[PDB]
mmCIF file of C-alpha atoms in Angstrom:
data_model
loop_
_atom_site.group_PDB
_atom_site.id
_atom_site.type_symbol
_atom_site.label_atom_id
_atom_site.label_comp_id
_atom_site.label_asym_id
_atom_site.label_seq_id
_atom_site.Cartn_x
_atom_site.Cartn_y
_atom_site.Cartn_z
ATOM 1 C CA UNK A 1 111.049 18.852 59.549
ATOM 2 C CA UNK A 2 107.831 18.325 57.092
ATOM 3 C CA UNK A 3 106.155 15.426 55.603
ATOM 4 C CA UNK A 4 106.849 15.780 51.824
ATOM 5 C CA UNK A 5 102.623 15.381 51.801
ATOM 6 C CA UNK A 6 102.230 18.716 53.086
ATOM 7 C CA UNK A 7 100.336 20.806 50.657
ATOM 8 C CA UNK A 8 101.730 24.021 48.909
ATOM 9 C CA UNK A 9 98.310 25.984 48.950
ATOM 10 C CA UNK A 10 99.432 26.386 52.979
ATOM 11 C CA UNK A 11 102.378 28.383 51.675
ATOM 12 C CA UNK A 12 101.360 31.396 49.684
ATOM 13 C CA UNK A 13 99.430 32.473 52.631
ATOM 14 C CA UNK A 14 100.720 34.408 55.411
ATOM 15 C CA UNK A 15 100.326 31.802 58.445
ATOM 16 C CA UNK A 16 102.632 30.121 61.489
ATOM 17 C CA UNK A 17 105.118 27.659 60.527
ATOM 18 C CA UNK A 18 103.355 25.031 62.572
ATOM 19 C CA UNK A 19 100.478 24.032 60.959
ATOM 20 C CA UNK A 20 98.404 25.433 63.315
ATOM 21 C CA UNK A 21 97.206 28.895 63.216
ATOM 22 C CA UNK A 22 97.819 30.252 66.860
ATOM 23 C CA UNK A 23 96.109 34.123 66.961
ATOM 24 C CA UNK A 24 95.040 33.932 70.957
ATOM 25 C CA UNK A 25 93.629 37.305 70.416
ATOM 26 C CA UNK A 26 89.876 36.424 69.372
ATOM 27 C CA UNK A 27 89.696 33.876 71.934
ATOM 28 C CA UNK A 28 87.571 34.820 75.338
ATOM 29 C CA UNK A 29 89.730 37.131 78.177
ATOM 30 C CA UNK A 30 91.845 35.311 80.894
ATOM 31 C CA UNK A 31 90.536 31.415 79.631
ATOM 32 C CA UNK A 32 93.715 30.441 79.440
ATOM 33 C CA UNK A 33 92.477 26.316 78.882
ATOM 34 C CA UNK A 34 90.392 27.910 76.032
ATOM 35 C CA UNK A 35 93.133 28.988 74.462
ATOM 36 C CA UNK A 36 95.845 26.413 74.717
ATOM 37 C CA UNK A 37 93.014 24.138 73.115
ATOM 38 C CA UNK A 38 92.976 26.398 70.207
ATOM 39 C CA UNK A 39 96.903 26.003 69.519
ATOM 40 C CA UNK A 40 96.745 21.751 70.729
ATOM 41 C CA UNK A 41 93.625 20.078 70.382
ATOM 42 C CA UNK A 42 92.811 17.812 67.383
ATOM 43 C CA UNK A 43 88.834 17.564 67.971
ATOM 44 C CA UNK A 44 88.664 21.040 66.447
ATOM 45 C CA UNK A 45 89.966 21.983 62.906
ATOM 46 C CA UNK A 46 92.122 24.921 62.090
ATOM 47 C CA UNK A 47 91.224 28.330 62.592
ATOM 48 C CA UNK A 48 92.138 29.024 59.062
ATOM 49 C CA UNK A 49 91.312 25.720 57.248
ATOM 50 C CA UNK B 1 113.935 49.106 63.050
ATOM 51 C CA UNK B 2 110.903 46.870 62.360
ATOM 52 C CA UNK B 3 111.265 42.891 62.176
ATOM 53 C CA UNK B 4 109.548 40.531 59.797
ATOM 54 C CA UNK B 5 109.854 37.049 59.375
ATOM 55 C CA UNK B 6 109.992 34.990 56.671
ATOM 56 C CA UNK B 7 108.544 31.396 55.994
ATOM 57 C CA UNK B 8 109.571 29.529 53.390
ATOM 58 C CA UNK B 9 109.589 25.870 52.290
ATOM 59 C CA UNK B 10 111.910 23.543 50.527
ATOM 60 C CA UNK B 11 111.917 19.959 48.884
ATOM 61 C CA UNK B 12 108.164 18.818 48.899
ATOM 62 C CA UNK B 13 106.542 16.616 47.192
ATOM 63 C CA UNK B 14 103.070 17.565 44.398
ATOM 64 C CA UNK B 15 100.237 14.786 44.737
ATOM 65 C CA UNK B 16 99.699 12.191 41.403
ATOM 66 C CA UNK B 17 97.102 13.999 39.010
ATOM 67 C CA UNK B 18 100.197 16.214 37.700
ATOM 68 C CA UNK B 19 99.384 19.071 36.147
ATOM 69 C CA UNK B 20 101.170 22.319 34.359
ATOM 70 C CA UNK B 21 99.736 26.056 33.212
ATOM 71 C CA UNK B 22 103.027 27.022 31.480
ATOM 72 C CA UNK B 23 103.106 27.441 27.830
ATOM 73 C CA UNK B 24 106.917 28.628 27.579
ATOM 74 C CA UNK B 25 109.134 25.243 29.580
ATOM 75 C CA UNK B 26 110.203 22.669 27.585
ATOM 76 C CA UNK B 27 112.533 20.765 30.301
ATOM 77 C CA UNK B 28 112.095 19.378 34.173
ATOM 78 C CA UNK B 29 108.575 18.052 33.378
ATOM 79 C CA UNK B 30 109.607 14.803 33.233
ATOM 80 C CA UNK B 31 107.653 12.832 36.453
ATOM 81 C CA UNK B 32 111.062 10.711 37.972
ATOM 82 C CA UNK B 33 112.880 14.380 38.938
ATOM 83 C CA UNK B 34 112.660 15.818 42.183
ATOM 84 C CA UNK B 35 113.970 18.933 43.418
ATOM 85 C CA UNK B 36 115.862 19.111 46.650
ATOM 86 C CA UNK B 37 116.342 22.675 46.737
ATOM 87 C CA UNK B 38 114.398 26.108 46.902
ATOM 88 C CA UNK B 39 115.819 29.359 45.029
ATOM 89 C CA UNK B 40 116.058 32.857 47.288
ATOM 90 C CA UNK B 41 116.818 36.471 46.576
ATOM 91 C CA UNK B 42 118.797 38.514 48.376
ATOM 92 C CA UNK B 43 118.819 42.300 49.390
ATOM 93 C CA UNK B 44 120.986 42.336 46.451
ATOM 94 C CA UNK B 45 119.416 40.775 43.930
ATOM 95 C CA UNK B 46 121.866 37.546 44.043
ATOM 96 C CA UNK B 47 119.916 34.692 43.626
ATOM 97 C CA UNK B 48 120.904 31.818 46.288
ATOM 98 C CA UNK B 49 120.092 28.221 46.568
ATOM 99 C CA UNK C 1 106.295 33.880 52.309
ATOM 100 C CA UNK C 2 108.962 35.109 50.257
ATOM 101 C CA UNK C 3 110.097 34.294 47.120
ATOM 102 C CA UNK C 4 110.749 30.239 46.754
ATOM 103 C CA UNK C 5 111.426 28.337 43.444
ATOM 104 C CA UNK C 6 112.186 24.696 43.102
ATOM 105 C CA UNK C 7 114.394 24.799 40.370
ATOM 106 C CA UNK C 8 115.989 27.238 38.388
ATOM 107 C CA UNK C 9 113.407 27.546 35.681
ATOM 108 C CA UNK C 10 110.651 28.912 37.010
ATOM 109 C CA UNK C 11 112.138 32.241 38.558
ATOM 110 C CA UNK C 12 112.900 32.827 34.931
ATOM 111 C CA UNK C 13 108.718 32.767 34.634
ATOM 112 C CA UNK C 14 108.029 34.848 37.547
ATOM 113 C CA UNK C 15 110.573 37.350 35.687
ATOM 114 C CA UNK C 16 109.341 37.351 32.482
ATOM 115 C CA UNK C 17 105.806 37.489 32.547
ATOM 116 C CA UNK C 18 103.800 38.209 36.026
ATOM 117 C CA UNK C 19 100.306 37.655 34.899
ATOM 118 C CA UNK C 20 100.594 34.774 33.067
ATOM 119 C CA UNK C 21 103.227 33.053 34.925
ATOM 120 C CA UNK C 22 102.456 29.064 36.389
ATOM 121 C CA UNK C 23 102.214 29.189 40.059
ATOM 122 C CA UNK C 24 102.900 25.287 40.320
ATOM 123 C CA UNK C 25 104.188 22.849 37.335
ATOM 124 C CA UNK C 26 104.507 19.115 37.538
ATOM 125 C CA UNK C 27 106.810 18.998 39.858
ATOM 126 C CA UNK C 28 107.962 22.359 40.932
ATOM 127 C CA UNK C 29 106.111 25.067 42.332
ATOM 128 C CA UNK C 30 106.733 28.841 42.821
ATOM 129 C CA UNK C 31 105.433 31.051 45.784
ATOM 130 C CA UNK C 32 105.398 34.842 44.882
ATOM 131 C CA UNK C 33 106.190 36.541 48.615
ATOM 132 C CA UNK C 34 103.245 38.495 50.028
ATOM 133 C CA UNK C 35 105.217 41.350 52.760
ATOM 134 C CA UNK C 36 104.073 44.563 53.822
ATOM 135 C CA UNK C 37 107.408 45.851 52.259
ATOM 136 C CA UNK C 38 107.045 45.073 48.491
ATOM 137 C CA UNK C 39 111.026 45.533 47.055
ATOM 138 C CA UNK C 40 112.458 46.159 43.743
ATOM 139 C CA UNK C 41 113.307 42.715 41.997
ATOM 140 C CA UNK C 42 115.787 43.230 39.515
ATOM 141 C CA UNK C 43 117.633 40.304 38.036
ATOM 142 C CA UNK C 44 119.743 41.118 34.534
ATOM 143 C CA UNK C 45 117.991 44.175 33.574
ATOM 144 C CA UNK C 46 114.567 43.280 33.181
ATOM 145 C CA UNK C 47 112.602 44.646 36.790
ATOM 146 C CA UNK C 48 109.621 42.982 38.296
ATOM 147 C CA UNK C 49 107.864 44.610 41.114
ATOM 148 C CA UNK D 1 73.453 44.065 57.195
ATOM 149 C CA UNK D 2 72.322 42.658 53.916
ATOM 150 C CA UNK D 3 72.510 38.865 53.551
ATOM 151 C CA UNK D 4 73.411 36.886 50.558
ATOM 152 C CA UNK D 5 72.575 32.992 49.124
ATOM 153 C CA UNK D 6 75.232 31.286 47.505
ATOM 154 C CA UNK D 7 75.389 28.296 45.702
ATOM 155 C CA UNK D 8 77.898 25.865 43.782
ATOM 156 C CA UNK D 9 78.148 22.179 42.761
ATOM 157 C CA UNK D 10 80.472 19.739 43.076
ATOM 158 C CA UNK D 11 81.223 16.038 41.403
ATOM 159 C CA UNK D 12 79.294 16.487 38.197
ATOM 160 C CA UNK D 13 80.309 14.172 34.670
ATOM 161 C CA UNK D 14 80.084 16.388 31.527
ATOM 162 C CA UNK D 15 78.869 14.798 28.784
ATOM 163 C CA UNK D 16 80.367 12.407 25.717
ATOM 164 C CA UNK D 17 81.772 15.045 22.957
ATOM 165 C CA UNK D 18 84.230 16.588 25.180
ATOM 166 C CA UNK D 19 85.617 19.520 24.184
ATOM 167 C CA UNK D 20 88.196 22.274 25.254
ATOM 168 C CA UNK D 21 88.866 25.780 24.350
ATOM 169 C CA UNK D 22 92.278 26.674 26.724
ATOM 170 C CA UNK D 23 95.534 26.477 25.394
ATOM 171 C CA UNK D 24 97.214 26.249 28.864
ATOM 172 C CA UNK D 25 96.835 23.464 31.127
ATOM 173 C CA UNK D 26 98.634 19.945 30.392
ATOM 174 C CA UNK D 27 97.812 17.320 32.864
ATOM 175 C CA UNK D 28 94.306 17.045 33.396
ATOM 176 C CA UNK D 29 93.210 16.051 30.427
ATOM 177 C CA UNK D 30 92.471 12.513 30.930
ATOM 178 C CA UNK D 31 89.341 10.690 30.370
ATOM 179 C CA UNK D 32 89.605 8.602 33.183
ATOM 180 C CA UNK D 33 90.075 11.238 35.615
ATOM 181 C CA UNK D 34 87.198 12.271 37.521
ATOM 182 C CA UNK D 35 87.145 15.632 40.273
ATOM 183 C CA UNK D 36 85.671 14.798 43.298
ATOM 184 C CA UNK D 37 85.817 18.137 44.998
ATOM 185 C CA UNK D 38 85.520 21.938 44.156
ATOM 186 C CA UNK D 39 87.819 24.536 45.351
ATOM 187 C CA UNK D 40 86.001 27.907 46.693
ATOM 188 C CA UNK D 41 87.655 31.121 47.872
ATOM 189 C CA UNK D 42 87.619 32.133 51.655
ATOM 190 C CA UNK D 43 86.950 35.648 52.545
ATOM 191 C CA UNK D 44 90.227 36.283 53.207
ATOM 192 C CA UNK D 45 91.179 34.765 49.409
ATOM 193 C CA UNK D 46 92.360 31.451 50.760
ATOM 194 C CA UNK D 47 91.540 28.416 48.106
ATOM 195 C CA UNK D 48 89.385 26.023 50.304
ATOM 196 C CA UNK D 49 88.386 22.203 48.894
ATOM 197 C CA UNK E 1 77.200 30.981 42.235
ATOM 198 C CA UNK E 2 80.202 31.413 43.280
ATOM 199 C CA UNK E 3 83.719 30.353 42.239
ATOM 200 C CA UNK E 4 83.660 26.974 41.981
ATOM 201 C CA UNK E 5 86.847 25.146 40.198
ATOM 202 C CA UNK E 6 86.919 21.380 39.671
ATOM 203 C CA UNK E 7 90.810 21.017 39.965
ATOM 204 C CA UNK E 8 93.773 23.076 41.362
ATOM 205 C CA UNK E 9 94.385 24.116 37.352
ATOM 206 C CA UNK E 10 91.374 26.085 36.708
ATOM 207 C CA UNK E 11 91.400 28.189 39.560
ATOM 208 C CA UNK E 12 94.768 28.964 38.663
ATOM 209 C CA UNK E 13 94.085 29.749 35.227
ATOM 210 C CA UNK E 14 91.103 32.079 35.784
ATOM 211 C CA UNK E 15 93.769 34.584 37.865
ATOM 212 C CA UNK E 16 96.325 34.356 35.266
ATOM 213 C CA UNK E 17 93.855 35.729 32.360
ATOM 214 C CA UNK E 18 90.322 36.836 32.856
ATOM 215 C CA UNK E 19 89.081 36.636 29.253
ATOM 216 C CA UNK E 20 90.333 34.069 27.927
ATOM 217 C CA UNK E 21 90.271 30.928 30.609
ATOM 218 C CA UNK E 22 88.131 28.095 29.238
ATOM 219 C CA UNK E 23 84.712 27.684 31.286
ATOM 220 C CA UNK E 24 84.500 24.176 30.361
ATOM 221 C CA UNK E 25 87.741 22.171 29.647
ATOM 222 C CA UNK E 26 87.575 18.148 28.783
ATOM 223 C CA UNK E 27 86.546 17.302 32.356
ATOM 224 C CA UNK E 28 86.724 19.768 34.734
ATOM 225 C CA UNK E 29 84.960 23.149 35.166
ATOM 226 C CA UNK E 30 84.430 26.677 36.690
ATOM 227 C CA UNK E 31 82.467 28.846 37.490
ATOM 228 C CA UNK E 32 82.822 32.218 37.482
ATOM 229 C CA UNK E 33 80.793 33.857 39.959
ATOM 230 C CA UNK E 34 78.188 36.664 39.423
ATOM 231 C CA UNK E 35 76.906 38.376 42.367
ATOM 232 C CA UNK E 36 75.602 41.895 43.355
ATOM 233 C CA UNK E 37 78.612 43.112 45.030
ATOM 234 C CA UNK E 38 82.406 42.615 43.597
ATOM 235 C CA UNK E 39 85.509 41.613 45.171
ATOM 236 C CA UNK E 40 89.436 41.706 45.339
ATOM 237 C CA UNK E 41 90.858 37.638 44.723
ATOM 238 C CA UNK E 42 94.155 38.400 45.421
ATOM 239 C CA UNK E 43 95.816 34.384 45.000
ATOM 240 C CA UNK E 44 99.576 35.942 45.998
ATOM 241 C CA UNK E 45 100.196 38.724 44.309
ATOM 242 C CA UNK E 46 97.333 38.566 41.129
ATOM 243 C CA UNK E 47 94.694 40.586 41.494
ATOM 244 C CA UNK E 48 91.199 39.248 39.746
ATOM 245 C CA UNK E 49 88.224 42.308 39.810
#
């Protein structure tokens, strides 16, 4: 389920169907609270937007 | 065998400064229609809603 | 993303003309699919790859 | 590794005579519409406000 | 300068036809940018040089 707000501009893009990009891969070795505050935290805007 | 997956949206909404690029539609511009479906085609070229 | 249309209309776009075809209208949008596997679209006779 | 300015503006007013040359877009063309952002494309071709 | 659209419309008209887009439309703009080394803007599957 969506908002009907969500923008279109997210969808011609190759991305994750949360709205939250979640590539763990460029984030630092074994920090594994560093990286779940990539794919939860809402201090921080997207990796992609 | 490789696996892909596909994202794909269906029945937003497109903010109020409407706008159109199309020369050749003549039809659904009208602002009180909304679209509750999203068009997909197959392996075999079968359109589906 | 694969291929998504909101109404009927605007696959006929995508179909006809590529280049000059209206990624959004007023109220209906259209989402050309971006996959490492690019397939043969083929809908009446008229082929759009 | 050779390093590049860039510049662009954003939330300008043109002038009184206004004029057009496309034969394309349909809803914009209000007077009393006024952009208050510019859209700029990412390095990896994604549309950014 | 870079590429710098007013609205959604003009940055969507500038990959559908390189030529002949409008610079200047009744209120918004673009610019199309002009720097020492050229790119790929692929927006889906339209390729600008």
């Amino acid at each position: 389920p969506t908002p009907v707000t969500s923008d279109v501009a997210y969808f011609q893009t190759p991305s994750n169907p949360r709205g939250r990009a979640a590539c763990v891969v460029s984030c630092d070795a074994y920090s594994n609270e560093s990286a779940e505050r990539l794919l939860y935290d809402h201090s921080i805007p997207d990796p992609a937007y | 065998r490789i696996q892909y997956t596909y994202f794909f949206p269906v029945g937003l909404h497109l903010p109020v400064p409407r706008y159109s690029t199309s020369v050749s539609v003549r039809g659904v511009e009208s602002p009180a229609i909304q679209s509750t479906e999203t068009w997909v085609v197959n392996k075999n070229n079968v359109p589906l809603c | 993303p694969t291929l998504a249309a909101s109404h009927r209309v605007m696959l006929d776009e995508y179909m006809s003309n590529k280049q000059t075809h209206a990624p959004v209208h007023m109220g209906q949008y259209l989402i050309e699919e971006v996959a490492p596997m690019k397939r043969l679209l083929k809908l009446g006779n008229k082929v759009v790859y």
